[PDB]
Amino acid sequence: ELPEDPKWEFPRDKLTLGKPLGEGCFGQVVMAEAVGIDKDKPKEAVTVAVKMLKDDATEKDLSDLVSEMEMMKMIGKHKNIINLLGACTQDGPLYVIFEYASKGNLREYLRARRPPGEEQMTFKDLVSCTYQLARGMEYLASQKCIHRDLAARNVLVTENNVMKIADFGLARDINNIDYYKKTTNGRLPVKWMAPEALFDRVYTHQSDVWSFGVLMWEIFTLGGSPYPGIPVEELFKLLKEGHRMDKPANCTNELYMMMRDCWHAVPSQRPTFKQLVEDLDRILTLT
Ligand SMILES: */C=C/C(=O)N1CCC(c2ccc(-c3nc(Nc4cc(C)n[nH]4)cc(N4CCN(C)CC4)n3)cc2)CC1
Ligand code: NA
Numbered sequence: 001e002l003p004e005d006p007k008w009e010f011p012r013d014k015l016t017l018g019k020p021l022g023e024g025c026f027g028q029v030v031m032a033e034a035v036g037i038d039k040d041k042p043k044e045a046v047t048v049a050v051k052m053l054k055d056d057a058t059e060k061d062l063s064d065l066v067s068e069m070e071m072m073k074m075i076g077k078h079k080n081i082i083n084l085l086g087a088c089t090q091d092g093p094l095y096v097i098f099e100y101a102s103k104g105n106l107r108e109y110l111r112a113r114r115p116p117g118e119e120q121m122t123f124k125d126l127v128s129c130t131y132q133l134a135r136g137m138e139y140l141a142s143q144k145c146i147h148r149d150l151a152a153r154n155v156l157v158t159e160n161n162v163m164k165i166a167d168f169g170l171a172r173d174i175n176n177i178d179y180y181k182k183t184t185n186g187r188l189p190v191k192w193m194a195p196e197a198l199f200d201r202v203y204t205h206q207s208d209v210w211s212f213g214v215l216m217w218e219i220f221t222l223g224g225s226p227y228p229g230i231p232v233e234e235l236f237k238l239l240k241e242g243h244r245m246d247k248p249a250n251c252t253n254e255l256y257m258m259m260r261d262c263w264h265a266v267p268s269q270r271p272t273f274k275q276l277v278e279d280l281d282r283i284l285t286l287t
Contacts, residue, residue, distance in 0.1 A: 002066070002089045008073065010037060010086035010097060021049060021104070026061035026169055028054045034097060037085050048085055051096040062094070068168045069096045075143050075168075080136030082156055082164040101156035101164055109157045110223035123250065124287050125161075126219055130255075131280040132163040137212060138273035140165070141205045144174045148185070148203055150211035151192045152218040177203050191226040195239055196267055206267035212276070213262025220251040254283065 018031040032050045036042035051068075053061055072084035088095040103109055106129070113121050133155065140147060147165065154167040170187060178184045184201035185193070194210035197203050214226050227235060227245060244263050247256040258279060264270045271279070 002094070004090055005073075005087075008084075008087050009090065010034065010088055010095075012088050012092060012095075015048075015050070015088065015095065015097070017050060023054060025167075026053075026057070026064035027051050031100065032097070034085070037097065046085075047100045049098045049100045051098060052093055064169045065094055065096060068171070069094075071145065071168045071171045072096075072098075074173065075140065075145055078136060078139040080132045080163055080165060081139065082166040098166075099164075101162075101166075102159045103157035103161070105153050105166075106155035106157055106163065107152035107218065107223045110152065110219065114222050121222065124284070126250075127255075127280065127284050127287060129163050130216055130219055131277070131284050133165065133215065134212070134273060134276045134280050136163070136165045137208060138277045141208070141273045145171055146174055146177075146203050146205060147171050147208055147211075148188055148197075149192070150208055150215055151189065152215060152223060155215075172203070174204070190232045190235055194267065195236065195265070198236060204267060205273065206270050209262050209270045209273065209276070210267075212273075213259045216255070216259050216262065217245055217248060220248040220255065222250075224248070252283075 014035045014037070016033045018033065021029040021031055023029070028051070030050050030052070032048050033045045034048045035045045037046050037048065038044060051065065053065060069084070069087055075081065077083060082101065083099040084096070085099060086097045088097070110121065113119065137147070137150070147168065147170070149167060149170040150165070154165070156164045156166045158164060178201075180201050182201065185197040185203060188197060190198075192211045192214045194203075194207035197207050217226060218224060230238065242265070244260060247253075258271070258276070261271050262276075
């Protein structure tokens with residue numbers, strides 16, 4: 001069925017599925033206890049998150065879940081990327097086992113910390129969040145990975161408020177895009193997507209940078225919805241004409257100019273992740 005990969009395999013007898021965390025796209029995610037998944041402590045149970053198919057799964061859903069698991073393998077480890085811990089790939093349903101982030105996705109996290117007009121985000125927190133995600137994305141870029149679905153909803157927050165890029169279902173090696181074919185990039189959410197991904201059917205690191213701009217806007221509006229009141233059907237005409245989202249209130253001119261830089265029409269005129277990391281480092285240090 002699936003070719004065995006001993007390096008990553010995890011005994012099913014050692015995994016105890018628990019309460020569900022939620023559902024979307026090609027899968028479901030449940031909380032679980034894994035005994036000895038940290039090999040240095042073979043009798044310790046760790047709380048983990050298990051991604052598996054839903055009952056109404058399609059062939060494509062399975063393909064996507066396999067693709068995500070395989071991608072997590074190719075990427076290697078980093079503090080701001082959700083860690084693959086192992087997989088049950090043999091003699092039963094596909095379980096992809098990830099490190100557990102207790103606080104769920106960043107969009108809901110930020111929305112829950114909006115003031116009345118479960119605590120409050122400081123400016124420094126927002127910049128920190130942004131910086132962590134830039135570092136994650138820089139590392140990703142260096143591993144030849146394009147994520148293609150960057151967005152607040154695809155970031156998980158740990159118990160200690162560490163930001164972890166997640167949901168690698170759409171992620172590709174940079175060389176594994178079907179350039180110029182009309183079906184290419186057809187499953188990317190339009191409001192986070194670089195124009196060239198649609199108009200040219202390509203996807204480079206600079207396309208991810210565009211998405212990161214949108215994510216920055218989400219962060220600074222505390223989980224606001226991009227292009228409020230503009231239907232998806234009308235976006236791409238407005239973008240060709242040079243329309244861009246206005247500056248969020250609790251955001252500096254400098255950080256807004258960085259967003260606008262990520263949204264440069266010309267992909268090559270956008271900053272790299274490395275430049276974003278350096279700039280955010282400087283700003284975070286100063287605050
Ligand atoms: C469509 C893209 C895609 O691949 N999916 C859609 C969204 C689905 C989803 C993912 C994650 C959660 C989720 N996860 C966690 N923790 C977690 C998950 C992982 C892999 N590691 N840690 C926690 C939560 N919550 C929900 C509300 N609780 C109050 C807090 C914890 N939710 C849900 C859905 C995946 C597939
Ligand atoms: Na089914």
